[PDB]
A paper describes a structure:
Polyethylene glycol (PEG) is a water-soluble, low immunogenic and biocompatible polymer formed by repeating units of ethylene glycol. In this regard, we have developed monoclonal antibodies that can bind specifically to PEG for universal detection and quantification of PEGylated drugs by anti-PEG sandwich enzyme-linked immunosorbent assay (ELISA). In this study, we determined the crystal structures of two PEG-specific Fab and one nonspecific Fab in complex with PEG. Both specific Fab/PEG complexes share a similar dimeric binding mode that is very different from that of the nonspecific complex.
In comparison, the refined model of 32D6-Fab in the trigonal crystal shows much larger conformational difference from those of 3.3-Fab and 2B5-Fab, with RMSD of 2.28 Å – 2.48 Å for 356–366 matched pairs of Cα atoms. It contains two bound PEG molecules. One is bound to the N-terminal side but shows a different disposition on the protein surface with a different conformation from those in the 3.3-Fab and 2B5-Fab crystals. The other is bound to the central cavity of 32D6-Fab, far away from the CDRs. On the other hand, the N-terminally bound PEG molecule to the Fv region in the 32D6-Fab crystal adopts a rather extended conformation. It is much more exposed to the solvent, and makes contacts to three different Fab molecules related by crystallographic lattice symmetry. The PEG molecule interacts with the first Fab mainly via van der Waals contacts with at least five heavy-chain residues and two light-chain residues. The four aromatic side chains of Y35(H), Y52(H), Y102(H) and Y109(H) are most involved, with a possible hydrogen bond formation between the hydroxyl group of Y109(H) and an oxygen atom of the PEG. The PEG molecule bound to the elbow region of 32D6-Fab also shows an extended conformation, which fits into a shallow groove at the interface of heavy chain and light chain. The residues that are in contact with the bound PEG include Q41(H), V94(H), F96(H), G117(H) and L119(H) from the VH domain, E159(H) and P160(H) from the CH1 domain, and Q39(L), R40(L), P41(L), G42(L), K43(L) and D90(L) from the VL domain.
Residue numbers in the entry:
A (entry chain H): 1 to 238
B (entry chain L): 2 to 217
The structure:
């Protein structure tokens, strides 16, 4: 029932101080034979333990990081926080919080609950919010009885971007693709939903895009139409 | 201090048993460890702890096909009947002056059925065209194994400039997906009769085609 969740910025500049916070549910950062720990994982690489501490003030550090890191525990909010001073690109990583359990039955120490991780990019590059464009299928692609409608989330930096449809009420037939990293250094991704070619006029499709580093939060209405928007007037076959 | 040595890769077939190895450094062969599993894009999951004598204790909710054993300085994770959701990175973990991780082992699960790709090709939106840009979007899904090559054509001529294509990665349904993007000017888009996205997978090819005369 113990759950942990990281929060922090997605992009920081070299030489800044990074601050992350873990919020714990279903357990208390004040009680038990636990330490509260941070671990990171540079993209494509392994897990690296950072430090842990207890409300009682006992703490322990990775030697190579000990002089750059500060850990605090906030019992009032059931949270604990990491600070990492003077970051460089070497500190780009997904950061995980974790509960470190001391098991009295064995004498062992092991992380028994983990957070989901938060990506932190360390870069001098500026953030860049995406443009969001509706993706309308060709009529031929729709002629089989189902069709893909979508949103193109174009030219953003850094990862990640979240996409939902109709604020999360629409999930069946939704596929959000991994982003491409283009030669420009900017990302693009596409998200589509499969819908019946049938009526569709009786349907609302809104792609909810969120890019937190640029505070780009957009709800884009996608018309349930092919790329030929005039077909219900001219009645032509394309 | 203590170090954990893991080989970075392993691969095995669905339904077999797999044994992964973690090796303790010199002077630490008496040490106990824990095993953690990390599925793609997820946080790790604690699996079990394991004594130097080979006694293991699973975490809560961990299937009984996961077990552990030991031999000298080596510590083993044994997966009895490999499942597709076992495809993951596996980290051993111990403790000394501080907490210690092995480098991880990426386990690739083999044996799923081959599957040809499905291809969806989108013309540029009117909105993007009005912003004086144009992007063709070719989406490639549900294929296995995960290697494809993508080729674009303007009418019948190959197009190489303006093409950006992802490396395939596995999706929720355990099949690979990939994307390719062709950047054009609106003039280029309206100048040709058609554009095509052609996907080659295991020697076989699937092509989709869009045309500015299809949209209005
Ligand atoms: O790199 S880790 O094994 O996790 C931490 C050690 O202090 C080194």
């Amino acid at each position: 029932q113990v759950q942990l969740q990281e929060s922090g910025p997605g992009l920081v500049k070299p030489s800044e101080t990074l601050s992350l916070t873990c919020t714990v549910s279903g357990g208390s950062v004040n009680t038990g034979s636990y330490y509260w720990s941070w671990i990171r994982q540079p993209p494509g690489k392994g897990l690296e333990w950072i430090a842990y501490s207890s409300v009682s003030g006992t703490s322990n550090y990775n030697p190579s990081l000990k002089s750059r890191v500060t850990l605090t525990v906030d019992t009032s909010k059931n949270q604990f926080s990491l600070s990492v001073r003077s970051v460089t690109a070497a500190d780009t990583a997904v950061y995980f919080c974790a509960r470190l359990n001391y098991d009295i039955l064995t004498g062992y120490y092991f992380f028994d609950f983990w957070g989901q991780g938060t990506l932190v990019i360390v870069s001098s590059a500026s953030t860049k919010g995406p443009s969001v464009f509706p993706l309308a299928p060709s009529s031929k692609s729709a002629s089989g009885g189902t069709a893909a409608l979508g949103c193109l989330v174009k030219d953003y930096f850094p990862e990640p971007v979240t996409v939902s449809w109709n604020s999360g009420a629409l999930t069946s037939g939704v596929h959000t693709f991994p982003a491409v990293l283009q030669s420009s250094g900017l990302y693009s991704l596409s998200s589509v939903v499969t819908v019946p070619s049938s009526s569709s006029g009786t349907q609302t499709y809104i792609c909810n895009v969120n890019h937190k580093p640029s505070n780009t939060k957009v709800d884009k209405r996608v018309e349930p139409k092919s790329c030929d928007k005039t077909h219900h007037h001219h009645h032509h076959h394309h | 201090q203590v170090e954990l040595t893991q080989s970075p890769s392993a691969s095995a077939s669905l339904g077999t048993s797999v044994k992964l190895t973690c090796t303790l450094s010199s002077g630490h062969s008496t040490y106990a460890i824990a095993w953690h599993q990390q599925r793609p894009g997820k946080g790790p999951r604690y699996l079990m702890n394991l004594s130097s004598g080979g006694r293991h204790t699973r975490g809560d909710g961990i299937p009984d096909r996961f077990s552990g054993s030991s031999s000298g300085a080596d510590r083993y994770l044994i997966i009895s009947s490999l499942q597709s959701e076992d495809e993951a990175d596996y980290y051993c973990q111990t403790w000394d002056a501080g907490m210690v991780f092995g480098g991880g082992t990426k386990l690739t699960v083999l044996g799923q059925s081959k599957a040809a790709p499905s291809v969806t090709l989108f013309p540029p939106s009117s909105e993007e065209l009005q912003a004086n840009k144009a992007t063709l979007v070719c989406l490639i899904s549900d294929f296995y194994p995960g290697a494809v090559t993508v080729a674009w054509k303007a009418d019948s001529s190959p197009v190489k400039a303006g093409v950006e294509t992802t490396t395939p990665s596995k999706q929720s349904n355990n099949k690979y997906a990939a994307s390719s993007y062709l950047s054009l000017t609106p003039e280029q888009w309206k100048s040709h009769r058609s554009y095509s996205c052609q996907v080659t997978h295991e020697g076989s090819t699937v092509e989709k085609t869009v045309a500015p005369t299809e949209c209005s």
